[PDB]
Amino acid sequence: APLPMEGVDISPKQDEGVLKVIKREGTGTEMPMIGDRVFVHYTGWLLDGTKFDSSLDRKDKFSFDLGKGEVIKAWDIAIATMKVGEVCHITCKPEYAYGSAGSPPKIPPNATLVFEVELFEFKGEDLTEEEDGGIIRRIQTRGEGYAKPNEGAIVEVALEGYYKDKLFDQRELRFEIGEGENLDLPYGLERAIQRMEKGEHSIVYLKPSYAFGSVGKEKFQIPPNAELKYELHLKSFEKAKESWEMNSEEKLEQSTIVKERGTVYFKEGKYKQALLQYKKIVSWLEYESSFSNEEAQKAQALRLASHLNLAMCHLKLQAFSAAIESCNKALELDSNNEKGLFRRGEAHLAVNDFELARADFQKVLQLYPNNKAAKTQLAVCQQRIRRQLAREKKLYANMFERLAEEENK
Amino acid sequence: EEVETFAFQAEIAQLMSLIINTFYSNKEIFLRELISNSSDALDKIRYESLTDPSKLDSGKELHINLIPNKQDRTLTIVDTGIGMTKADLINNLGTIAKSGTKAFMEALQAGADISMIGQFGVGFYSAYLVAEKVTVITKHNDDEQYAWESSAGGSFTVRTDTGEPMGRGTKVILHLKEDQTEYLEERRIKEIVKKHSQFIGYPITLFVEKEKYIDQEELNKTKPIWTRNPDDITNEEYGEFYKSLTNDWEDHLAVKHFSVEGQLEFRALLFVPRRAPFDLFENRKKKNNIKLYVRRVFIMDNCEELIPEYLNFIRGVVDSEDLPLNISREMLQQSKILKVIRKNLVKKCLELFTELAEDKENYKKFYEQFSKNIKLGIHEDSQNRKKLSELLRYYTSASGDEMVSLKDYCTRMKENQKHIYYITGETKDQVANSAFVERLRKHGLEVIYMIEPIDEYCVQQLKEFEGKTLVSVTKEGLELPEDEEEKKKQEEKKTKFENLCKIMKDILEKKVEKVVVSNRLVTSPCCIVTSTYGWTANMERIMKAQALRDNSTMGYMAAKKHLEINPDHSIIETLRQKAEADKNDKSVKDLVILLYETALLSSGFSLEDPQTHANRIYRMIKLGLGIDEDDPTADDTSRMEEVD
Amino acid sequence: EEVETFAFQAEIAQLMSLIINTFYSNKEIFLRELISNSSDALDKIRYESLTDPSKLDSGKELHINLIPNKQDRTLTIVDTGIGMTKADLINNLGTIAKSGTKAFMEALQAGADISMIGQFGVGFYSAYLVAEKVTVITKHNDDEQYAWESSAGGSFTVRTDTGEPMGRGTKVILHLKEDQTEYLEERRIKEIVKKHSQFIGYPITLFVEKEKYIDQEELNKTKPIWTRNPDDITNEEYGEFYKSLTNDWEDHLAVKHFSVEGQLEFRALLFVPRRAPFDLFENRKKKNNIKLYVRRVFIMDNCEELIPEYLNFIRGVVDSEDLPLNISREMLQQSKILKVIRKNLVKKCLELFTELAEDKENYKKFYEQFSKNIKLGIHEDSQNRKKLSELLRYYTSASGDEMVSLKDYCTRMKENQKHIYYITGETKDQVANSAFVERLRKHGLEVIYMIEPIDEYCVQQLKEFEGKTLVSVTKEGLELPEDEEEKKKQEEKKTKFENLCKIMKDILEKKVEKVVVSNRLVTSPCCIVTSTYGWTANMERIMKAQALRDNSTMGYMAAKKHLEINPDHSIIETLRQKAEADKNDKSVKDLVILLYETALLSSGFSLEDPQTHANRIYRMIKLGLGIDED
Amino acid sequence: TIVPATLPQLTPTLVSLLEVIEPEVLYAGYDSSVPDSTWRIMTTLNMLGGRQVIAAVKWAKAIPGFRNLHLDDQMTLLQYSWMSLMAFALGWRSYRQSSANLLCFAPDLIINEQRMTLPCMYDQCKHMLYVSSELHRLQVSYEEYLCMKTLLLLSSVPKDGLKSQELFDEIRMTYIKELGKAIVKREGNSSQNWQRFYQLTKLLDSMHEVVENLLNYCFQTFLDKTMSIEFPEMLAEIITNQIPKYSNGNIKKLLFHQK
Ligand SMILES: Nc1ncnc2c1ncn2[C@@H]1O[C@H](COP(=O)(O)OP(=O)(O)OP(=O)(O)O)[C@@H](O)[C@H]1O
Ligand SMILES: Nc1ncnc2c1ncn2[C@@H]1O[C@H](COP(=O)(O)OP(=O)(O)OP(=O)(O)O)[C@@H](O)[C@H]1O
Ligand SMILES: C[C@@H]1C[C@H]2[C@@H]3CCC4=CC(=O)C=C[C@]4(C)[C@@]3(F)[C@@H](O)C[C@]2(C)[C@@]1(O)C(=O)CO
Ligand SMILES: [Mg+2]
Ligand SMILES: [Mg+2]
């Protein structure tokens, strides 16, 4: 039924129409930050006891992004001022709801609405490619405009932070995005700076997959696979030109530069950086572009090199399944590429796909009978199979006899 | 202004031709019309004798005689009705649109029991559809016997008869055309007569010359009984009527006899047979076996508008005395009438079934024959869906071998049973032993077993019973009334096996949408469930098997398969440990596939290619038997280091 | 004896009542009739003007106007036809069943190119189905304007017309019944005209008021192209006609323009759609698609008698002059006529399909949408199996992805074949990899793959093709023309393998009919086959899903299962040796069942338990993982 | 002697599947006390547009049939119809909330006539309002709406065709059939259903005019620099990739009905 909400006063300084209501106390933990996804209870009453139909009427917790304005303002504020486990019923003053719009069918214009809010839990933003939580952002106070920097952009950011329980002092960074080792900083801060708005002030947490890796150095007392958190202030940037506005010339020119850079990174053992560089080829050349025949041929050579080296990087990085995908792309471009084929076979052997590994090493020899390594591989594959078969023979040596006995116990 | 006023005229010559050539589509009806005229002739004399018995001094037996004559190509019809005076003979047969019977009815007072067939005035002339010449002999009590003669030449004659006196009544002689002689055969006569007359209030005798002597065969032996008050009719009487009507050696299972008064007058008899016909859904003649009569004369059959198809097993008669007909008397003049008839017939059929259902033994006999029809009714009849559903019966996990109603379900069920649980499948045994119902059995919940293929459609349409929705135990997201402690334990277990969730999905990436940890399995290491939307197992096999279907729809509607893992099986725990130790262990890859294939079969899905299941098994058998490995098995360096 | 002679008379009051109340089944008809009367009026003057052009001095445009008037609750129809003289108003409208049209036709020279609608003399009065009063204004070239009026009360009047001049023609004004005013709506009028009279030769214009001005819309914009010589019609012209006729947006796939000139005369256009047709909107389900017209006027559109159901995707028009009609003009008299028409329509459809078959690409397009109908036509209508079967196409083991005719199979038969081999199943792939075709493949024999559920019904009629017998490769007694040396080897081996047949006959006694030593198999240890007479696994699985199933037929159609053993397989030899050593070895009892269950699945039978099968596997797996008993 | 049995018609669930698939209305806006500078309104709407447009992609991926098209075809169809879909979405929200000439973009922002300060809105709101007006006038149901929205996605192809063309054609007929059912279900009629259908097909075909007139202003706004307009990066990309397909005449309009 509707609550006697008329008996509750307004939260300090909430001229924003947010009620000082507590029905349940929380856990005592801190407040969510900007961008945090706060999972909440959400139900309530609309003006004068009108039922509010919502997701928790079926117990479905709502995921809310704080500070982005995706909900009516009074709700956004209640989240900012509430701790986990706390329950509030906010008599949202109309101006902080739908105003005079009268959002039909259930919101009268200039209506005071009562929303039941509970915080169950929250997380910061995932700034990573996959939902591993490798890079987490908690926005502190700032960020404006809709522009963000990208790879190749020159960025001015103030960086200060922590590792383990010790701090990095503050330094100003003026750099090209993607040059993680010439910041001598975690890979994750590239990926994170690329998502920052001008003036942005935020905290970014890094797990080992984004945190210092082979970029880690003992001078900071930080091992590879580091636990890190940093405070960043983005002041300005010069955004790099995008592929949708690039010329066919520029795409090949930049892909060539990247191939050379990727080659070096790979040779230096900087396989993640090499991988990151070779991917740049791929998007410039895979992106639709009208090339002359000469330009197209150059693009094909560059695309093949990326796909072959990406596979090579994946093999070094033990991403054998990724090596399969990248070498397959290389093989689509060149079906007899000795390196792509040999490497696909290696990736299969690496994960015990012995039969497939053999199929590829056999093909390498059919095309290249002198590939001594393919003979070596092929022979290993065969012996690995033989050993397993022997184990299976032993394993099931008396299978039927044992089952006949089990079935009669 | 000056206005000239004129009367309407008619051209007799053309009018006569239209009646003969454009009004009727089927020549056999000429017999119908002549018989109807005679039955009216008989009712009128009966009516008069009612107040003055001397009217029958000339003869008391009221009957109709049919006398074919092969030798002369003629057919004679003789009645014993009032007959006509010279004046009437001329005025009524010589005037194309006059009707003496209509005038008679107008003369009669309200309360008369007279119901007569006809009013149009043009029926007589239908004789010329088959006749070359027509002669009419008649004797009225108040006049001399006269003979009328004509052909449709535009004139006719009247002379005094010179032959044997008739006493009273009318004798019509047709001289048939040379190619219409089929109407002189006894078989054809009887067929026509049965089809169009049958419930005439007077007996009809057909006089047939045989090996000679005249065999006098009476037709119209069966009397209509729908005309009687039902209170007064015994079950034996209904049974005999039924058998005669349907030529069914067996009796009826149930009968409903009722009437409707006001606006449209009705009487009807609806019978439910004791056996469904073998061709119930196959015969291509029109499905509704309801015959419509007007003033006891057959009008129409095979009318789609009278009954919804799902009730096309009811046999019966509808009779009214007030509907408008077209000129040929072969169909109703206004279709809105049928709309009303249908509404009422359906309503009463449902009442019959409801009442029938109170007798459990008889209901079983009924249901066993007609449950298919009820189910179709659920799909199509949106108005009576809430009544039809109470006639459904199912086997359940509780019910032993008895079938029970949905109401029965819902009173045995438990306080937390906000949903009604059901399972579908090919047969009772498979369903009963299904993994999908074991958890439910553990907690004592009742599950409805739906077996017939048709049930897949009914569940769509039904949705809920008395506010409780139906849920499928083979879909994802099944809710059980679990304890909070149980829920917490189930969640704690999900922090384990995280690696198998991922590894198995990768092994089976191209085959399943998801791999999850579940709670509906308390036996079996795994099962396959379908997501909330799309075709489920059974729905898919049924659709695939239809003789006539477009398979292009199967590119849209298909199951999304999720593989559920039982964390408290020993196979799963062993795999967890083994896979964590080495995620690339070949034996894990192979056993995971084998479990998957097994799960498909046990969950109701076919295999994409059963041969390669079979081959996996054969391989294991060979190893298990010690088949020597001789048959089961056969047994520059820097180029790839180049950085480019 | 003196015999009196009398003429026949008629009662006018009753006659008028019958015409109005019990001749017509509907009310759409009154418009249908008035339009037909106008087109006749126009033809009469058009004809006369051919020998004397001055007839048109009073006006040259020949057309029909429809003018509803909501305010006065009236509807007016105006033609520009010949008109009527005072004498004709009396003789033709005042006399029931008088027909001026008929007399006109009789008075024509025999070669006049005239086809008129009418002869009964009663349609005019259909006006009273919707009117309370009817007023007719007319001008004939040889007379004064006159106004005829009647309420159909048994009299009518004639006055000299003192209103606006017409020049020439007839104007019919209906004063409508108070309760039937939907006929004044633009929507309703258009629906009626399009349904019944869209092929009338003279243009029809509907005049309505809207934001105001009068919107003058021509309704009959489509010409009856079937009247044209077929050689002069282009594909674009047929395509446009087709779209207009069917409210399609897609073109036609094929068309046959045909005519008959015998005792009956007619013309027809038959179209094959590029997509199977469907009921986009509510209509009678299974309505057929051939419309019948007489003298360009619609008569009926769902006469089942016209064409077999299997050809109901043909869309088309049949236009036939001189057929006898019912007084309502909604039905044909003498249904024997339809029998004749049906014979001819079917004959020509088959010729059309034969012609499509010449173009391989187009035939595929055809067949992809319509192969079901061909198959139904094999099953049904047996007199045409001899032609329909040549339109069938199947995938075979030798065709890759092409579908071929039975003629191609025949062409490729080996000299030792007397049989055409086929297999049925669920998918391509499940059949292609089947054990049942392995030996046939070994000997180079081609097998036809039948896939659709419908193929099972069809295959039972197609017993012979060009004298060759059609046989299945999943049944008992399959003949393959191999050398007798193989038979001798089996007889030599049966001496040691019958011991297993006997043991396996005791195991599984309740599940199979028999266990025999076979030779159809090469690599699998065993398989399950169907008896020579009985039903196959595919038949059972489809019968089980019919939904509208009987019960006695399910018992009846159950298959008999025979188990065949491959003697040469290593599993079977190991089994023979152990089984002979100990008949009751538990290991044998379970191995035999496992092989049986496996054989059912690979042979296409559903495994009915199915849980036991799963459980057997689970135990095998536990040992495979090193899991102990406890 | 064994003959085929007839079957009951299976009821399609395509409309209910779509109801499940459809995204929520997204919030966007600025405090109304901030002046309604033409450019502010536009930037706000571009940001809203970007988010709605991406939601429309997962929405499309979830659609039966569509999801089985080669990915390149899926992207092509999304580009060619993205404005038809957004315009239709706006027209719906507008007319459902009010009979007035309002453009209801988000629960946060509704533009009335006095706020249409952009020459484009002054000139083209008549089309935006037209769509709202027609949906209002025609009392369009939600089921019909969803069916039509799907068809708009399928309304255009390259003149060069699609790779999975023979699937595309299926899908199109499939949804035409579903719309026909959405109509029968609200009407209960016979011949009126074809008429209702044409009342609606004519929308879907006139939507091409609505889009092209707006499209030209959209391109002018993006390409020129007359106002302080920020765009989502994703719209900047679709705009420059789409301009040459459009301007070179490489897009084939599939117009369902003519007359
Ligand atoms: N056998 C008969 N005995 C006495 N009167 C007859 C007989 N047959 C016909 N009549 C008279 O001739 C009249 C004309 O009958 P007819 O059958 O032509 O038309 P109807 O029965 O009035 O019309 P309908 O076509 O509606 O049956 C009757 O109304 C009746 O008065
Ligand atoms: N608009 C007109 N202009 C000239 N003459 C007309 C017109 N309408 C009717 N007539 C005349 O009056 C007669 C009345 O014919 P009516 O339409 O009633 O019969 P019909 O044409 O034979 O129709 P049906 O065969 O359908 O009964 C016609 O034969 C014709 O001579
Ligand atoms: C008048 C045009 C049409 C506009 C769009 C119409 C459809 C639409 C509906 C919404 O719910 C949110 C944003 C969009 C998707 C839109 F509002 C903005 O993108 C800006 C837009 C292109 C436009 O305002 C411009 O030309 C300015 O670039
Ligand atoms: Mg009579
Ligand atoms: Mg006429």
PDB file of C-alpha atoms in Angstrom, chain C residues 373-515:
ATOM      1  CA  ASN C 373       1.899 -30.026 -55.657  1.00  0.00           C
ATOM      2  CA  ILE C 374       3.397 -32.246 -58.226  1.00  0.00           C
ATOM      3  CA  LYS C 375       3.800 -34.947 -55.657  1.00  0.00           C
ATOM      4  CA  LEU C 376       0.188 -34.621 -54.572  1.00  0.00           C
ATOM      5  CA  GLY C 377      -0.804 -35.034 -58.171  1.00  0.00           C
ATOM      6  CA  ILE C 378       0.955 -38.408 -58.288  1.00  0.00           C
ATOM      7  CA  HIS C 379      -0.846 -39.662 -55.335  1.00  0.00           C
ATOM      8  CA  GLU C 380      -4.185 -38.258 -56.538  1.00  0.00           C
ATOM      9  CA  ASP C 381      -5.524 -38.277 -60.094  1.00  0.00           C
ATOM     10  CA  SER C 382      -3.859 -41.453 -61.227  1.00  0.00           C
ATOM     11  CA  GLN C 383      -4.582 -41.021 -64.904  1.00  0.00           C
ATOM     12  CA  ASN C 384      -1.838 -38.399 -65.080  1.00  0.00           C
ATOM     13  CA  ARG C 385       0.952 -40.201 -63.206  1.00  0.00           C
ATOM     14  CA  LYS C 386       2.405 -41.031 -66.561  1.00  0.00           C
ATOM     15  CA  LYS C 387       3.178 -37.359 -67.199  1.00  0.00           C
ATOM     16  CA  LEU C 388       3.594 -35.939 -63.778  1.00  0.00           C
ATOM     17  CA  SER C 389       6.336 -38.261 -62.775  1.00  0.00           C
ATOM     18  CA  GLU C 390       8.616 -36.783 -65.393  1.00  0.00           C
ATOM     19  CA  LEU C 391       8.484 -33.490 -63.609  1.00  0.00           C
ATOM     20  CA  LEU C 392      10.010 -34.941 -60.479  1.00  0.00           C
ATOM     21  CA  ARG C 393      13.523 -34.108 -59.458  1.00  0.00           C
ATOM     22  CA  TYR C 394      15.681 -35.741 -56.754  1.00  0.00           C
ATOM     23  CA  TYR C 395      19.164 -35.568 -55.304  1.00  0.00           C
ATOM     24  CA  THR C 396      21.093 -38.729 -55.818  1.00  0.00           C
ATOM     25  CA  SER C 397      24.318 -40.205 -54.644  1.00  0.00           C
ATOM     26  CA  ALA C 398      25.840 -39.396 -58.019  1.00  0.00           C
ATOM     27  CA  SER C 399      24.600 -35.831 -58.508  1.00  0.00           C
ATOM     28  CA  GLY C 400      26.465 -33.705 -56.045  1.00  0.00           C
ATOM     29  CA  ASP C 401      24.022 -30.867 -55.504  1.00  0.00           C
ATOM     30  CA  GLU C 402      22.025 -31.172 -58.672  1.00  0.00           C
ATOM     31  CA  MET C 403      18.604 -32.600 -58.768  1.00  0.00           C
ATOM     32  CA  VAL C 404      17.929 -34.934 -61.569  1.00  0.00           C
ATOM     33  CA  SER C 405      15.042 -36.560 -63.262  1.00  0.00           C
ATOM     34  CA  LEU C 406      14.199 -40.201 -63.220  1.00  0.00           C
ATOM     35  CA  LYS C 407      15.176 -40.181 -66.836  1.00  0.00           C
ATOM     36  CA  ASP C 408      18.731 -39.294 -65.936  1.00  0.00           C
ATOM     37  CA  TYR C 409      18.889 -42.084 -63.472  1.00  0.00           C
ATOM     38  CA  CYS C 410      17.655 -44.443 -66.138  1.00  0.00           C
ATOM     39  CA  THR C 411      20.220 -43.182 -68.602  1.00  0.00           C
ATOM     40  CA  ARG C 412      23.000 -44.007 -66.184  1.00  0.00           C
ATOM     41  CA  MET C 413      21.771 -47.462 -65.151  1.00  0.00           C
ATOM     42  CA  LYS C 414      24.146 -50.337 -65.491  1.00  0.00           C
ATOM     43  CA  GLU C 415      23.181 -53.169 -67.791  1.00  0.00           C
ATOM     44  CA  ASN C 416      22.649 -55.452 -64.844  1.00  0.00           C
ATOM     45  CA  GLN C 417      20.099 -53.226 -63.195  1.00  0.00           C
ATOM     46  CA  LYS C 418      16.463 -54.109 -63.364  1.00  0.00           C
ATOM     47  CA  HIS C 419      15.915 -52.094 -60.263  1.00  0.00           C
ATOM     48  CA  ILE C 420      16.104 -48.454 -59.362  1.00  0.00           C
ATOM     49  CA  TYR C 421      17.436 -47.993 -55.908  1.00  0.00           C
ATOM     50  CA  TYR C 422      16.303 -45.413 -53.458  1.00  0.00           C
ATOM     51  CA  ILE C 423      16.488 -44.653 -49.825  1.00  0.00           C
ATOM     52  CA  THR C 424      14.375 -42.453 -47.649  1.00  0.00           C
ATOM     53  CA  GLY C 425      15.388 -40.503 -44.591  1.00  0.00           C
ATOM     54  CA  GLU C 426      15.369 -37.241 -42.698  1.00  0.00           C
ATOM     55  CA  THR C 427      18.294 -35.255 -44.131  1.00  0.00           C
ATOM     56  CA  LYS C 428      20.701 -35.469 -47.021  1.00  0.00           C
ATOM     57  CA  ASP C 429      23.570 -36.214 -44.887  1.00  0.00           C
ATOM     58  CA  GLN C 430      22.069 -38.905 -42.768  1.00  0.00           C
ATOM     59  CA  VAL C 431      21.219 -40.821 -45.835  1.00  0.00           C
ATOM     60  CA  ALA C 432      24.415 -40.178 -47.665  1.00  0.00           C
ATOM     61  CA  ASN C 433      26.502 -41.599 -44.839  1.00  0.00           C
ATOM     62  CA  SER C 434      24.220 -44.525 -44.188  1.00  0.00           C
ATOM     63  CA  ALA C 435      25.533 -48.015 -43.905  1.00  0.00           C
ATOM     64  CA  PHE C 436      22.753 -49.089 -46.209  1.00  0.00           C
ATOM     65  CA  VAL C 437      24.271 -47.456 -49.209  1.00  0.00           C
ATOM     66  CA  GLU C 438      27.831 -48.407 -48.581  1.00  0.00           C
ATOM     67  CA  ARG C 439      27.749 -51.575 -50.519  1.00  0.00           C
ATOM     68  CA  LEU C 440      25.817 -50.077 -53.342  1.00  0.00           C
ATOM     69  CA  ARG C 441      28.424 -47.372 -53.566  1.00  0.00           C
ATOM     70  CA  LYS C 442      31.124 -50.050 -53.598  1.00  0.00           C
ATOM     71  CA  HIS C 443      29.651 -51.567 -56.723  1.00  0.00           C
ATOM     72  CA  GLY C 444      29.032 -48.200 -58.372  1.00  0.00           C
ATOM     73  CA  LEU C 445      25.261 -48.196 -58.191  1.00  0.00           C
ATOM     74  CA  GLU C 446      23.383 -44.936 -57.872  1.00  0.00           C
ATOM     75  CA  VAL C 447      20.897 -44.312 -55.116  1.00  0.00           C
ATOM     76  CA  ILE C 448      18.107 -41.756 -55.113  1.00  0.00           C
ATOM     77  CA  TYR C 449      17.753 -39.835 -51.905  1.00  0.00           C
ATOM     78  CA  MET C 450      14.209 -39.111 -50.861  1.00  0.00           C
ATOM     79  CA  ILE C 451      13.855 -36.616 -48.089  1.00  0.00           C
ATOM     80  CA  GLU C 452      10.546 -34.950 -47.640  1.00  0.00           C
ATOM     81  CA  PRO C 453       7.911 -36.578 -45.391  1.00  0.00           C
ATOM     82  CA  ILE C 454       5.578 -36.550 -48.365  1.00  0.00           C
ATOM     83  CA  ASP C 455       7.912 -38.836 -50.268  1.00  0.00           C
ATOM     84  CA  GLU C 456       6.660 -41.731 -48.171  1.00  0.00           C
ATOM     85  CA  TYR C 457       3.149 -41.508 -49.456  1.00  0.00           C
ATOM     86  CA  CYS C 458       4.118 -41.067 -53.199  1.00  0.00           C
ATOM     87  CA  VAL C 459       6.648 -43.832 -53.292  1.00  0.00           C
ATOM     88  CA  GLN C 460       3.843 -46.273 -52.819  1.00  0.00           C
ATOM     89  CA  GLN C 461       2.235 -45.310 -56.128  1.00  0.00           C
ATOM     90  CA  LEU C 462       5.366 -44.998 -58.182  1.00  0.00           C
ATOM     91  CA  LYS C 463       6.079 -48.624 -58.391  1.00  0.00           C
ATOM     92  CA  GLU C 464       7.457 -48.594 -61.912  1.00  0.00           C
ATOM     93  CA  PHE C 465       9.335 -46.177 -64.152  1.00  0.00           C
ATOM     94  CA  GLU C 466       9.858 -47.023 -67.802  1.00  0.00           C
ATOM     95  CA  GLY C 467       9.436 -50.677 -66.937  1.00  0.00           C
ATOM     96  CA  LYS C 468      11.986 -50.652 -64.130  1.00  0.00           C
ATOM     97  CA  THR C 469      11.001 -51.525 -60.589  1.00  0.00           C
ATOM     98  CA  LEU C 470      11.636 -49.131 -57.766  1.00  0.00           C
ATOM     99  CA  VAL C 471      13.211 -50.799 -54.671  1.00  0.00           C
ATOM    100  CA  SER C 472      14.527 -49.892 -51.226  1.00  0.00           C
ATOM    101  CA  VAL C 473      17.791 -50.450 -49.771  1.00  0.00           C
ATOM    102  CA  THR C 474      16.685 -50.615 -46.182  1.00  0.00           C
ATOM    103  CA  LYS C 475      14.537 -53.711 -46.583  1.00  0.00           C
ATOM    104  CA  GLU C 476      14.922 -57.424 -46.248  1.00  0.00           C
ATOM    105  CA  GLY C 477      15.956 -59.348 -49.341  1.00  0.00           C
ATOM    106  CA  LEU C 478      17.744 -56.605 -51.201  1.00  0.00           C
ATOM    107  CA  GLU C 479      19.054 -57.887 -54.498  1.00  0.00           C
ATOM    108  CA  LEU C 480      22.405 -56.832 -55.842  1.00  0.00           C
ATOM    109  CA  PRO C 481      23.752 -58.680 -58.961  1.00  0.00           C
ATOM    110  CA  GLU C 482      26.938 -60.006 -57.370  1.00  0.00           C
ATOM    111  CA  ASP C 483      28.834 -63.219 -58.181  1.00  0.00           C
ATOM    112  CA  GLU C 484      27.809 -66.431 -56.348  1.00  0.00           C
ATOM    113  CA  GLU C 485      31.266 -66.783 -54.787  1.00  0.00           C
ATOM    114  CA  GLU C 486      30.051 -64.430 -52.059  1.00  0.00           C
ATOM    115  CA  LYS C 487      27.070 -66.656 -51.300  1.00  0.00           C
ATOM    116  CA  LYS C 488      29.316 -69.626 -50.889  1.00  0.00           C
ATOM    117  CA  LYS C 489      31.500 -67.757 -48.454  1.00  0.00           C
ATOM    118  CA  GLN C 490      28.532 -66.866 -46.333  1.00  0.00           C
ATOM    119  CA  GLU C 491      27.311 -70.443 -46.276  1.00  0.00           C
ATOM    120  CA  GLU C 492      30.774 -71.512 -45.189  1.00  0.00           C
ATOM    121  CA  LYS C 493      30.776 -68.974 -42.351  1.00  0.00           C
ATOM    122  CA  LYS C 494      27.185 -69.432 -41.174  1.00  0.00           C
ATOM    123  CA  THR C 495      28.328 -72.700 -39.703  1.00  0.00           C
ATOM    124  CA  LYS C 496      30.199 -70.830 -36.984  1.00  0.00           C
ATOM    125  CA  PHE C 497      28.040 -67.745 -36.777  1.00  0.00           C
ATOM    126  CA  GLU C 498      24.654 -69.428 -36.390  1.00  0.00           C
ATOM    127  CA  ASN C 499      25.723 -70.100 -32.840  1.00  0.00           C
ATOM    128  CA  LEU C 500      25.503 -66.378 -32.251  1.00  0.00           C
ATOM    129  CA  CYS C 501      22.298 -66.082 -34.113  1.00  0.00           C
ATOM    130  CA  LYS C 502      20.830 -68.512 -31.644  1.00  0.00           C
ATOM    131  CA  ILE C 503      22.276 -66.814 -28.605  1.00  0.00           C
ATOM    132  CA  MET C 504      21.220 -63.404 -29.838  1.00  0.00           C
ATOM    133  CA  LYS C 505      17.748 -64.732 -30.700  1.00  0.00           C
ATOM    134  CA  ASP C 506      17.379 -65.604 -26.983  1.00  0.00           C
ATOM    135  CA  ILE C 507      18.825 -62.239 -26.005  1.00  0.00           C
ATOM    136  CA  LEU C 508      16.510 -59.729 -27.372  1.00  0.00           C
ATOM    137  CA  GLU C 509      13.812 -62.387 -27.972  1.00  0.00           C
ATOM    138  CA  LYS C 510      11.156 -59.852 -27.190  1.00  0.00           C
ATOM    139  CA  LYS C 511      12.738 -57.123 -29.342  1.00  0.00           C
ATOM    140  CA  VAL C 512      13.573 -58.583 -32.768  1.00  0.00           C
ATOM    141  CA  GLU C 513      12.055 -61.063 -35.173  1.00  0.00           C
ATOM    142  CA  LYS C 514      15.284 -62.800 -35.989  1.00  0.00           C
ATOM    143  CA  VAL C 515      19.012 -62.504 -36.231  1.00  0.00           C
TER     144      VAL C 515
END
